[PDB]
Chains A and B, each alone.
Chain A
Amino acid sequence: MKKEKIDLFYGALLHDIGKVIQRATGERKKHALVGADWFDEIADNQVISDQIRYHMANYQSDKLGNDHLAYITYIADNIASGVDRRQSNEESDEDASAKIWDTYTNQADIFNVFGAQTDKRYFKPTVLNLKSKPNFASATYEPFSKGDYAAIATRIKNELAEFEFNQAQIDSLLNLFEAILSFVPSSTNSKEIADISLAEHSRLTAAFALAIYDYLEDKGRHNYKEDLFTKASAFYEEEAFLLASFDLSGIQDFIYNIATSGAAKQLKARSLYLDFMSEYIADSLLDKLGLNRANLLYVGGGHAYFVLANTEKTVETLVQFEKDFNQFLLANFQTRLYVAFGWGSFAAKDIMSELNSPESYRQIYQKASRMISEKKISRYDYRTLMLLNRGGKSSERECEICHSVENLVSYHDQKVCDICRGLYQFSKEIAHDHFIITENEGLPIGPNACLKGVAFEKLSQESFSRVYVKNDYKAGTIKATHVFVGDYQCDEIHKYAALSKNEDGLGIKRLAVVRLDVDDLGAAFMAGFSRQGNGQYSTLSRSATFSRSMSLFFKVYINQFASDKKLSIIYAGGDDVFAIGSWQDIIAFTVELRQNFIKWTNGKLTLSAGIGLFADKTPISLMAHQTGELEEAAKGNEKDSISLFSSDYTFKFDRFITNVYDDKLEQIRYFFNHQDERGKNFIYKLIELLRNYESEEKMNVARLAYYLTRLEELTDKDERDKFKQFKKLFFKWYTNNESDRKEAELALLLYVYEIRKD
């Protein structure tokens, strides 16, 4: 895109850095002036300087030309905050501004305005780091401190001292901004709620400024002052934006359908490959329109949302891009993968909290969702279907993994297709942190574009169009797009069955697969904030801060939750979590993740989990299928449930945590490490009497009283004055109700799996 668009984007993104400098230094000057002065100390660019200086249109508008870009940026800021700041009169009286602005308040938690009203929490402003322990919001973190922002300002100045404001560096700046201001409020107005990070605020301002620029360029309207300042109320009514989206169907089937050995390496490679396919689709769509990742609201799980200019050229470019990528998917994966695009026209007034209404903010999503659904139902036209059904191929042999016929090759005396071959090659390249896009080298990720994972030292010897860096907040020497995925891996999957044994040989030789899902994520996105304030809390900014909160929780933070655990996180994006490892570590990881989530979201969103146990060398597709069934069963238990190893042990998460994992299983490892192998068999008998209580209810209870008082006689002298507790304990667990019987059954089964020697 043009140099003018580059300058406009940079001015829109850097307009509120003066707020950061003002909070760090404690100066009493206006934030725009401080930002412009600080920018002039580090870069000689007049256009960005005046954009930062005059991003409030009330500040010396008469000195600015009618075609000046700040009249765009200004109104874009009004779009990003969600509130028309002209009506609040906060820019015209300094004395009132000193009493309205509460500068001693940190960023509020996004969940303070989510769901039912609860206690308020506030985030301590911290620089995001991959290895850091979580930054949970807290009501104690409300007071503001200058020392926290001192390091923020120092690092921002150090990174922007030698920054080049050109095209190729643009993406890296966004990463830097995400690294620093994700826990700093955009506005400290007492009348407003500071749940919006300045991070996303500046990204949204830049995206909307680009959209308005494209719209005005299409319509030939270059009098920005007249259109966006004098007639801003009229511009707010014009349907100026397109809420676009794409959905890629076939991700689960493509990832999990592996039939032979080597399924682990393929499985992780396909997960990374498909995430990068989604990222490349988003970035190539943005490149074709001359936009950048600032317009990307959310990417992940095959779902991506964008805010685009509402022009016929945008609709055309969307249709032709969708057709080209559908042709590419038909050529490379036949009908397994299919991308469907979506869009809905909306105005500025549909997302400002003071002007919009809840059902319109729902309908702007619903239009794109409905159109995506209709395109998903009717996929291919007559010509494509006829081309698919031409037949006429005499192939004796098939692919051993994905059963494809196209382009079969021999490799390690197996017969793989071209895609399988590329994925086997890429499985050794996933260890690198740099992934380039070439024209014919690597896994075909797009039209005349292939993805290749290349080490850093060889990057200077490779030809590419775009480069991606995985799990890095540091702006490297190479201008690269930064992506974050959950990729923790302790050992190989085929070793996890044997790794469940301890140093003493204790533990069953089994492995576990956990599938976890966030409950009603889509309902949370659509109307999770609409419960409070009569729906005044339904705007784009808070929904997309919710999206970034979940993204940082599930693509960066799960890697820290999985630290020091013998497991691998295969897929972690959006709401679906897939992990595989030793069964004890899998259970502990699931419980820890649930607890950290319930602490992160204040309790307002729950998970549902399925944990399937399997033996060594179990084919991965079967493990994924059975664990998906267990996850569905856990969902069926009014959600907020965990299902362990079959549907019969479905519990509420809090019940499993409080009563089973940390209560009964503890009060069984205890007493039952005090009994020999002769008395560690009654553990099987107590299981049968719990599985057979509905037969012979009252003599099954008697059979218990007897069998419990026999374990307490087969013991050892005074070791038996210690098993006098089990009898009293397991008796009441047996006699209370069915829920505690099931909990004791699961606890006994867990203990049996822990102490097994075979």
Chain B
Amino acid sequence: TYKLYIMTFQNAHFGSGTLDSSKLTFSADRIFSALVLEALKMGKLDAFLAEANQDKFTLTDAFPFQFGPFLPKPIGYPKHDQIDQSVDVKEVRRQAKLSKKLQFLALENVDDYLNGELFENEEHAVIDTVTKNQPHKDDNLYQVATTRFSNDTSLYVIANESDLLNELMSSLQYSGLGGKRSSGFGRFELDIQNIPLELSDRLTKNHSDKVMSLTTALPVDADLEEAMEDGHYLLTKSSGFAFSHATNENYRKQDLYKFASGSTFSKTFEGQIVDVRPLDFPHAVLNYAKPLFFKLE
């Protein structure tokens, strides 16, 4: 809610379940895990844990940044109250398909999207697959997907201004983000920018109006009811193998189903640093689900 962190990538790989799958943008649990690993490699893991335990710490999923912050399409607002038209069915289905394909909108027109206007996606990155082999066992021919960006398009997140977070981001920018980081993917250059006046006044965390989430956040059990009755959302898995320097064998962490972005709700909630570690495991596995919200008209 304080800064507007920008990460300019050249090549990246954000696996969505397979080595040959790469999403355009990553989720906040991935960057929180990356921060946790960088902090533990630094040695100042306890300070970052204490900072994350505070309610001031807020993080959001990466969104596209092309001469202005972008926001995920608010799932649950194709509402006919602003899209009531007398056009033919062909144009109605064409605009429905165009809105379904849309995933990100520029900040300057997000409310315009809520006025019935129709916008198209913009060229942000090309996702291409590369085949690689192992020239000692002539059976492995594995494919890796990338997210090669273009047109000065970066990724951005919103988080509090902290010196520990600043230095952690600076160490992240030479350590990569997601995927085969020691192969030419994930690396970025960081820039710190101020939140625009048209955006900072909308980033909220505590009130009872229509809020669109910015983080893949699973609410606490106390207030899930309000997200169930009057909440529009999408369900995203967070499975995978838990990285661990303490166990020789790789353990699958517990599959957890969160709420995607931008899921719309009628009231805000509280996130969880949920322990997705398997049983009998020495150290925790922290999954970050803490929402930053956006007010709607």
Contact = CB atoms under 8 A, between A and B. Distances in A.
- Chain A in direct contact with chain B (Cβ < 8 angstroms): yes
A624 to B, nearest CB: 11
A574 B164 CA distance: 56
Interface string B240-270: 0000000001111011110000000000000
B238 to A, nearest CB: 10
Given A403-B239, A520-B90, A389 B20 contact: no
Interface stretch (B37-45, B104-112, B166-174, B224-232): B224-232
Nearest to B256: A389
A385 B269 CA distance: 16
A615 B133 CA distance: 14
B55 interface: no
A392 interface: yes
B232 A382 contact: no
A540 B131 CA distance: 51
B75 interface: yes
B257 A394 contact: no
Nearest to A622: B20
Interface string A612-638: 000101110110011000000000000
Given A394-B251, A622-B129, A382 B225 contact: yes
Interface string B280-293: 11000000000000
B232 A619 contact: no
A335 B231 contact: no
B252 A395 contact: yes
B221 interface: yes
B279 A394 contact: yes
A116 B287 CA distance: 57
A513 B191 CA distance: 43
Given A378-B232, A381-B228, A403-B239, A622 B250 contact: no
B235 to A, nearest CB: 5
Contacts of B21: 621, 625
B179 to A, nearest CB: 16
A282 B274 CA distance: 40
A259 B18 CA distance: 8
B196 interface: no
Contacts of B254: 391-393
Given A380-B235, A382-B224, A523 B93 contact: yes
B280 A394 contact: yes
A184 interface: no
B68 interface: no
B255 A405 contact: yes
Interface string A371-404: 0010001111110011011011111111000010
A526 interface: yes
B28 interface: no
B276 interface: yes
Contacts of B231: 378
Contacts of A626: 129
Ranked 7 nearest A-B pairs via Cβ: A394-B278, A391-B254, A394-B279, A527-B89, A526-B89, A523-B90, A382-B228
Interface of A: 257, 259, 334-335, 362, 373, 377-382, 385-386, 388-389, 391-398, 403, 405, 520, 522-523, 526-527, 615, 617-619, 621-622, 625-626
Given A621-B18, A625-B21, 19 more contacts: A257-B17, A362-B89, A378-B228, A378-B233, A381-B228, A385-B257, A389-B256, A391-B256, A394-B280, A397-B252, A403-B239, A520-B90, A522-B93, A526-B89, A526-B93, A527-B89, A527-B90, A615-B131, A622-B143
14 contacts: A362-B89, A377-B76, A377-B234, A381-B228, A391-B255, A391-B274, A391-B276, A393-B278, A394-B279, A395-B278, A396-B251, A526-B93, A527-B88, A622-B20
